[PDB]
Amino acid sequence: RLIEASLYGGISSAITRSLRDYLLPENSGVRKAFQDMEAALRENRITLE
Amino acid sequence: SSKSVANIIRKTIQREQNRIRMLNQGLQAVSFGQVRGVRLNVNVRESHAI
């Protein structure tokens, strides 16, 4: 998308729609703590099912 | 719990805002016809701010 938008030129519609998806990096720190803390419950629930 | 999570979220938000602000300065005073500058405007949604 980046390359071809540059090739034809103009304000790309697709880039404009998903602006946050392109310009912001995804951060794992906020998440993995809670995945590990959540683990004991997840396993228990799956076992019960 | 609680406050510490809020602090890490706030610091991440602050760092992203600052980096964007740095990128933003490189684009000042670019002349394209009648356009004279470009910016990436970053804001925080209310429903999440509260």
Next chain:
Amino acid sequence: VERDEVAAQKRELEKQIERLSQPSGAEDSRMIALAERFGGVLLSEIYDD
């Protein structure tokens, strides 16, 4: 006996994984609160990048 020995290895592996989790993997049990209770920042977090 084989079951229990493998269980011991699995417990060690989870404990090792868990130490590397969050927020910037460290002795997270108390260190996060200790980091904010003074006007300071965790060194390992400064060297995250």
